[PDB]
Design a protein around this ligand. Structure first.
Ligand SMILES: *Cc1cc2c(cc1C)nc1c(=O)[nH]c(=O)nc-1n2C[C@H](O)[C@H](O)[C@H](O)COP(=O)(O)OP(=O)(O)OC[C@H]1O[C@@H](n2cnc3c(N)ncnc32)[C@H](O)[C@@H]1O
Ligand SMILES: *Cc1cc2c(cc1C)nc1c(=O)[nH]c(=O)nc-1n2C[C@H](O)[C@H](O)[C@H](O)COP(=O)(O)OP(=O)(O)OC[C@H]1O[C@@H](n2cnc3c(N)ncnc32)[C@H](O)[C@@H]1O
Ligand SMILES: CC(C)=CCC/C(C)=C/CC/C(C)=C/CO
Ligand SMILES: CC(C)=CCC/C(C)=C/CC/C(C)=C/CO
Lengths: 499, 494
């Protein structure tokens, strides 16, 4: 019945919030819709895989909050395999390479590729992390899709195709589905293009030993019976002295404050009294989550390494079911595996097939890309379609269609009376990620601590010391990368000398 | 507890569905979330206004289903005032005119305006009403916003500005918010540009005497205690022999079938067991409703008529709070009034003000446009902001952002086990309107009648005889309208 704070949702964000509040001496209850904690993280255990992340998995340098939280819980990381060459597969052929960006030889195409990535970051520098709608050209950029932006920016098909893949992979949505402003914000708030795309020195550097689901599970262990499973919240009443929160099983919870730690659109599953203010009422119908199937194919050995391939494949083209893969082999070198994502419209199209049909299409793709018949001999397969989850709505995260972020964005983490808002979608650094979940949950908890007079306004937003275990190397560019002209820039230089 | 069919939602669609099933001899229950029926229609009664429609109001020729249903319930219509001149207000000046389309005098601008409207209809002819995702260029058109389309199509700022106003008014959304394919479908399925924009011989020809809320109220009267008010549905369970439907007050209802007669995205307010199939699960997070405040300013007399103005104003520009008005005066000539819409981003911006501040801005605008100081002397004001409604989500209707209709559109009216889908959003003719609500409710009810073996598949979709009271005149074009070149077309001839 009665407590200090009810947290709605037992994903990483809700669990981080609850843990902070609990450590501060308050009585907290976590109401979780599912028969498990973790949300968009899920670690499956069986004898064939030992453990496998079917949801969120990767962490890396500059993600100091998730790293600190997991270390406190007794977790360790290991490095994703990137010793050997990466592969860019374009127009039916594989081109091995090293370094984060797929290289290009054609001088015109080189200028176009260089300019695309540079311009993404240039534009991002004008967008405040904590208030993207404050960018000088916020309106113009928000009223365009990423498809429109790419059409104007990319002078070669080669750059446009790679750029399209980048968007599909970053946000599991099509270029025509998403606001240019929101996407530019999304990349900037992860530290930019290099940081977001990189394995070594980027967002995909590491995974947790034993799975990321242990973060939420081990917090649940600390909280004991304060976490209530199979308690979907259906109703929140703020008309009286104490806030009343009701679940689907008719249980009633009374609290001083509430933290909503669920995807913004999933707030629609709750009936509010009094009704939400107009801007939030409409906002929560305007913010879908992307579409992805995470697929892991198991093999007897990590055979790709013997051909000097690390397992990373960047795969261009409509025909390919998977556009991106990473080596998912255990750090011990056993349970050899390739992880791959089926993205956006392909997730919709291929969900029609059976599990066995999808396994076949993936093996046949990998055999082609890796040039290896061994790829046709899987020993096991695991997969998870996140589009089917009632209490997630999609993965990895929420995207904003054109026009929404400038009109409704300021509403996202604005408290509604005694309801405060967490969830990775409300973060200002690595929003969309486990790191953003920790930032948002802890910030929401501190907002309540301030409302109770326990801390000064000063302490609501707190910086995080850099991890000693996962240090960040700075992002650098070369003189040529900074100053080489764009394609239209070269054409004007050509017009100039005609004098 | 037990019945043949539970209908979720007591708007026109739910009520039309329940009425059909009831008349066929089945036991129906209507579960309505609010303390009233009518949904996106709402008729307010008081001494100052007598009655006023604060939600859906207009009906016209080709809307034969709403007209038949209303007539059966004992309702009459009257004609919206369009005797005198309409006004197009552009760049701070009023230009009176006659006929449905605001005219232009510059020759290049004429070609551009003519081509814009014509192209909207040309493109619409390639889009099947019952399956817009089957259009030959479905993907290309769905991957563009209406803003992009207008940028390519409109060679003059004059046409682009009018076209933008058209989009804002039709679907209460910005051009950059909505899919080009969805918008072209939307116009086509109302019968095209002339039919959708016209008062005389179009969608805005008429209103109901006493208000449109009477449609839902009078069906409630027929159904008696079968309508349950303040019963928001929270849970639907389809795992067992009979479907179980639970409300917020913990009441439990058992049925053979369910009709969901609520806006698609409002399906999110219901927890499903088993979970919805993946496509519907995601679809219902991708389909928002538009933004509008409906505002009615009352005056001692319909003073605009004395200046040979009917009360219709088409008002261009960012500064104007209201882009479109109609005469809302009663057929008797009393309760003189102007109805206006505050649309899309302006609804969001101006909601911050007080009621009195909004009234002042509207009166000042109307004084300018009508060229009359009398507009500064209102006797009364009524307004409704539909963006604040938990059980509507907006108005008039659901819009589709780029990419959604092709990927998720086929899911809209696909049954989920024993749940069938009504609501104006599922109609194929005047979807978005009270007419579409009726079509969809009755079609969903007949789907259940077929599933029960009471009617053949043949009878699920049924044509409607033309109203004798509101006959449709055909839409015509002139030889010059059909064959005059576009601006780029003239440039190639040069
Ligand atoms: C799915 C996914 C996510 C993902 C990604 C790949 C996939 C396939 N890869 C990632 C990666 O490699 N690294 C990373 O950092 N992130 C990655 N992502 C995203 C990541 O998993 C998410 O950002 C993060 O897990 C989100 O955490 P958050 O706490 O903000 O949100 P949640 O996990 O969705 O938790 C919400 C919980 O609330 C419950 N819920 C929902 N509705 C209710 C109601 N009505 N009542 C009570 N509880 C409710 C959910 O069940 C969930 O547990
Ligand atoms: C608001 C509006 C609408 C409108 C328009 C101008 C405005 C400001 N002008 C129109 C016009 O001039 N002519 C016309 O034909 N239409 C016009 N529109 C649109 C029109 O009002 C709508 O298309 C029509 O009313 C829609 O009817 P429908 O039956 O399909 O939908 P509804 O009215 O929204 O009814 C839904 C009912 O369901 C209840 N509800 C919602 N959630 C639940 C739950 N969970 N449980 C039980 N009931 C629920 C709603 O309360 C509503 O009553
Ligand atoms: C290497 C290139 C061209 C693109 C990589 C883009 C990217 C963000 C990959 C990471 C995808 C991922 C694991 C998302 C889940 O957080
Ligand atoms: C005549 C012009 C330029 C625009 C009119 C367009 C239009 C659809 C008007 C009707 C608006 C309305 C009452 C919508 C609600 O159904």
């Amino acid at each position: 019945n009665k407590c200090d704070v009810v947290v709605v949702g037992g994903g990483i964000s809700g669990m981080a919030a609850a843990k902070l509040l609990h450590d501060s001496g308050l009585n907290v209850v976590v109401l979780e819709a599912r028969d498990r904690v973790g949300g968009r993280t899920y670690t499956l255990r069986n004898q064939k895989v030992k453990y496998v992340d079917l949801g969120g998995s990767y962490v890396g340098p500059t993600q100091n909050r998730i790293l600190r939280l997991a270390k406190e819980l007794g977790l360790e990381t290991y490095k994703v395999n990137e010793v050997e060459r990466l592969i860019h597969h374009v127009k039916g052929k594989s081109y091995p390479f090293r370094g984060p960006f797929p290289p290009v030889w054609n001088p015109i195409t080189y200028l176009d590729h260089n300019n695309f990535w540079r311009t993404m970051d240039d534009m991002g520098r004008e967008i405040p992390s904590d208030a993207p709608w404050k960018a000088p050209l916020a309106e113009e950029w928000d009223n365009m899709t990423m498809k429109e932006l790419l059409d104007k920016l990319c002078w070669t098909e080669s750059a446009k195709q790679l750029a399209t893949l980048f968007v599909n992979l970053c946000v599991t949505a099509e270029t025509h589905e998403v606001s240019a402003l929101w996407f530019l914000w999304y990349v900037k708030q992860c530290g930019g293009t290099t940081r977001i795309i990189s394995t070594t020195n980027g967002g995909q550097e590491r995974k947790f030993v034993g799975g990321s689901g242990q973060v939420s599970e081990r917090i649940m262990d600390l909280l004991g019976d304060r976490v209530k499973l199979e308690r979907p919240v259906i109703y929140i009443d703020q008309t009286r002295e104490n806030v009343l929160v009701e679940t689907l099983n008719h249980e009633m919870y009374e609290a001083k404050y509430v933290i909503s730690a669920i995807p913004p659109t999933l707030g629609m599953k709750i009936h509010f009294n009094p009704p939400l203010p107009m801007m939030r009422n409409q906002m929560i119908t305007r913010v879908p989550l992307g579409s992805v199937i995470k697929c892991i194919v198991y093999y007897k050995e990590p055979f790709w390494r013997k051909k000097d391939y690390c397992g990373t494949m960047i795969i261009d083209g409509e025909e390919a079911p998977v556009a991106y893969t990473l080596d998912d082999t255990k750090p011990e070198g056993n349970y050899a595996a390739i992880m791959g994502f089926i993205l956006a419209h392909k997730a919709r199209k291929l969900a029609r097939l059976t599990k066995e049909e999808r396994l076949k299409k993936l093996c046949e793709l990998y055999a082609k890309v890796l040039g290896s018949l061994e790829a046709l001999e899987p020993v096991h397969y695991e997969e998870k379609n996140w589009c089917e989850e009632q209490y997630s709505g999609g993965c990895y995260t929420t995207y904003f269609p054109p026009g929404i972020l400038t009109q409704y964005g300021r509403v996202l983490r604005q408290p509604v009376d005694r309801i405060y808002f967490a969830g990775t979608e409300t973060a200002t650094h690595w929003s969309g990620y486990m790191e953003g979940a920790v930032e948002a949950g802890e910030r929401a908890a501190r907002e309540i601590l301030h409302a109770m007079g326990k801390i000064p306004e000063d302490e609501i937003w707190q910086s995080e010391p850099e991890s000693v275990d996962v240090p960040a190397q700075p992002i650098t560019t070369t003189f040529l990368e900074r100053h080489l002209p764009s394609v239209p820039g070269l054409l004007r230089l050509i017009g100039l000398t005609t004098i």
